[PDB]
Amino acid sequence: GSGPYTKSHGPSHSHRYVRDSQPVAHGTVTHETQAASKHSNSPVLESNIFISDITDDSGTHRWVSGHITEVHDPLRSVSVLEPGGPGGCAHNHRELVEVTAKTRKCLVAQNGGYFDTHTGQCLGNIISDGKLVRNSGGIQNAQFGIRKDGTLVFGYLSEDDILDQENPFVQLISGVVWLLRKGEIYINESIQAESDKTQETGNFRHFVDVISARTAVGHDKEGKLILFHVDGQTDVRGMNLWQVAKFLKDQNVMNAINLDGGGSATYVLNGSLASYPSDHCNPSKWRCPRAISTVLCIHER
Amino acid sequence: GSGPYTKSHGPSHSHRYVRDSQPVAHGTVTHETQAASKHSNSPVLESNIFISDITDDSGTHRWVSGHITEVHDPLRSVSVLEPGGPGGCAHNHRELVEVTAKTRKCLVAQNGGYFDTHTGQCLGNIISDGKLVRNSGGIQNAQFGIRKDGTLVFGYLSEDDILDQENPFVQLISGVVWLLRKGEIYINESIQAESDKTGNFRHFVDVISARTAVGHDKEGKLILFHVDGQTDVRGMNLWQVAKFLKDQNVMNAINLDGGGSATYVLNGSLASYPSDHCNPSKWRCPRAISTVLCIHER
């Protein structure tokens, strides 16, 4: 449908290919790090609603709406959850964000990584509360992870990077497109890194350029984790990734990656749906949240 | 600001004026009644999201979004709540829907009646869980109430109507504008009944904004309506609301408070996009409002 890939999810080329093709400005490191903030005497998070006027290239103005969530102690409060609960990805299980969220008393929960809509298979790298759920085998998509010592990681990782046991990843999830790198829009570089020069680069561009519902995760200079969500509907309402990156750039976000969007985009506040999903409740025309894969959860305990 | 009245809330004329000026087709009765459904073997409610394309008279298209909530046993599950809890109106108290809702474990809660934004005074008639909270003194605004035997009441009521003790109101709340009467748009009649002959009321009707409404369908189920918006920028005007509910087979409905007051709270969590700002920031914030319309367990 609105997926970035037509055959298999992710590029076929290696991490060294990604490294050699990135701009000299970033040296030879294909990721960014930031020590997580440690505000253990603060509330867990801040949930912010925005309704903003967006201008597209044609000059027409549109209203968009969504949430920005700030997490003050990411190491202790952020979890990557399998659909429905532990073991969900092994069963190709799909489940609403709310249902999965209620397994951990999540204060805020958003849909997470990409999945195969036909088979329900989880995609990308997945580490959930210290447990390796899925090793993609070094597939080069944008990554977000939290290491055991509190380091936030954004960008492109090798299979060796994610399997390290010195300072192991305790949370890891994959998206598609690295939106911001070091406070700069990184979409053009992401297209080079995350699409196959061979198999249908056009469909990947349409995924970037079309407006839709979108979600993203990033961080600011203070080490706070930033969750982004904008409601929309592919080719009808919402934002394209250029607009998402600019919006986050103006929110002082340093690094951010794009997570699953379209009808998957869901914002759940303390177990209740608090967004407007795009899918229909067939055969009726009411709107319904989608059964999705992994979930990004922010919990109190 | 976007209030329907510039001086005092409500028209200056009596219920006798409303009766004398209403259309001949409706006789001398200025309200509608409907036995509430009592589906005790159904879920308490069904809350559905809509995102729809609306066209106005000028032909321009806009997207609107909100919720429709159906209540299967209104008598046992619907409550009109005072801001913050019992006694809130006596103190001119204003409070978030979310805060007021947690005093009754509301599954769904929306902002309720109109209030004075400067003093915080509650407006209209208010009966909360069998308790008479406010007697407006016969002010002729659109009313919604539930009587003890399960009768749903919509429309214009006299002071004698609300003080009756034979089959007394257990819930009662006032809005502004009777949107639908007997399945027909009733906005022109509402302007006649609820405004003084002495433009500002018309603008309140015609401008687009966030809106909320309560009504019922042929089955006696109660319908809660909410559409997000911002006065003169996004949302719907009352003509569009009446048509939207009319196409959902709503028989009678009244317009409740809108604008920045419009709030939809799902299981204690804010689940809409309010228009007010979190001053001095540009984020959006729910407003501290007055009475709340609450849907709770039986």
Ligand SMILES: O=P(O)(O)OC[C@H]1O[C@H](O)[C@@H](O)[C@@H](O)[C@@H]1O
């Ligand atoms: O998440 P999206 O972009 O809305 O795509 C989801 C869509 O995929 C295809 O186009 C169809 O199967 C649609 O029925 C479905 O709604």
Ligand SMILES: O=P(O)(O)OC[C@H]1O[C@H](O)[C@@H](O)[C@@H](O)[C@@H]1O
């Ligand atoms: O609920 P509304 O329609 O957005 O109006 C609220 C606003 O009305 C006017 O613009 C002003 O008087 C504001 O002080 C007020 O906050």
Ligand SMILES: CC(=O)N[C@@H]1[C@@H](O)[C@H](O)[C@@H](CO)O[C@@H]1O
């Ligand atoms: C615009 C957008 O992000 N659409 C996504 C699609 O790309 C993805 O493949 C699918 C399943 O993960 O969910 C959504 O439809």
Ligand SMILES: CC(=O)N[C@@H]1[C@@H](O)[C@H](O)[C@@H](CO)O[C@@H]1O
């Ligand atoms: C468009 C609309 O419903 N605006 C209302 C206004 O009429 C009302 O007076 C005020 C307080 O009750 O709340 C909102 O601003």
Ligand SMILES: *[C@@H]1O[C@H](CO)[C@@H](O)[C@H](O)[C@H]1NC(C)=O
């Ligand atoms: C990305 O490349 C496009 C070419 O499609 C160009 O027009 C645009 O200016 C570039 N944007 C950035 C942020 O480099």
Ligand SMILES: *[C@@H]1O[C@H](CO)[C@@H](O)[C@H](O)[C@H]1NC(C)=O
């Ligand atoms: C979350 O919701 C549950 C019931 O839905 C409630 O008991 C709990 O207090 C809520 N938590 C917060 C932080 O509001």
Ligand SMILES: *[C@@H]1O[C@H](CO)[C@@H](O)[C@H](O)[C@H]1NC(C)=O
């Ligand atoms: C409202 O009233 C005016 C004049 O009385 C009339 O022209 C208009 O068509 C009416 N509209 C509706 C919907 O009744």
Ligand SMILES: *[C@@H]1O[C@H](CO)[C@@H](O)[C@H](O)[C@H]1NC(C)=O
């Ligand atoms: C409200 O939450 C409780 C469980 O926490 C339950 O009654 C129901 O699932 C929820 N109701 C709605 C309408 O979401």
Ligand SMILES: [Cl-]
């Ligand atoms: Cl090499």
Ligand SMILES: [Cl-]
């Ligand atoms: Cl008179």
Ligand SMILES: [Cl-]
């Ligand atoms: Cl107007």
